[PDB]
Design a protein around this ligand. Structure first.
Ligand code: DPV
Ligand code: DPV
Ligand code: DPV
Ligand code: DPV
Ligand code: DPV
Ligand code: DPV
Ligand code: DPV
Ligand code: DPV
Ligand code: DPV
Ligand code: DPV
Length: 10
């Protein structure tokens, strides 16, 4: 989901 993409970004 969308928050998993943030974990990737970081
Ligand atoms: C990240 C969405 C937060 C809700 C507010 C935005 C509403 C519009 C987008 C809704 C997208 C659907 O998300 P989902 O696959 O059910 O997300 C599950 C997230 N957790 C694993 C942390 C429970
Ligand atoms: C902000 C919350 C509003 C709630 C309004 C009442 C329920 C509406 C249910 C239908 C919601 C339909 O869209 P969704 O599957 O979530 O879109 C996901 C969009 N992305 C793929 C870009 C993450
Ligand atoms: C308070 C809650 C209100 C509802 C919030 C819903 C947020 C949904 C965000 C969905 C973002 C999807 O972006 P994406 O497809 O990965 O971007 C692609 C970008 N380029 C074209 C430049 C490559
Ligand atoms: C306007 C408000 C925007 C809110 C955006 C929320 C995004 C949430 C993303 C939540 C990701 C959780 O990752 P985590 O495993 O706890 O991260 C660990 C990070 N370090 C390795 C540096 C300690
Ligand atoms: C942006 C915040 C989204 C919160 C969504 C919670 C939905 C329930 C998911 C199941 C419980 C997840 O484990 P928790 O208890 O959160 O422990 C993990 C805490 N960190 C992420 C900081 C490592
Ligand atoms: C607009 C800015 C948006 C920023 C979004 C940030 C998302 C990531 C949040 C990560 C939260 C990290 O918490 P922490 O320091 O390890 O918790 C310390 C307290 N406890 C030990 C009780 C859990
Ligand atoms: C002040 C607020 C600024 C908000 C910025 C929001 C945009 C974040 C964009 C994603 C950042 C991570 O990009 P990346 O996947 O590692 O690089 C490729 C990125 N493009 C495909 C778009 C070229
Ligand atoms: C207008 C609203 C704009 C909101 C923009 C919010 C952006 C929040 C960004 C939060 C960044 C958290 O950094 P972090 O996990 O420690 O970094 C990764 C660190 N390592 C490389 C060592 C793993
Ligand atoms: C892990 C990333 C956390 C932030 C996420 C939100 C922003 C993503 C868009 C990419 C931001 C890129 O910024 P930058 O021009 O290279 O940095 C400016 C600061 N310095 C001059 C010191 C390098
Ligand atoms: C709507 C679209 C707007 C896009 C705006 C421009 C986004 C530019 C993203 C540039 C991302 C470059 O990431 P990188 O330094 O290779 O990896 C991250 C490395 N750190 C964790 C150390 C910071």
């Amino acid at each position: 989901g969308l928050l998993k993409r943030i974990k990737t970004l970081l």
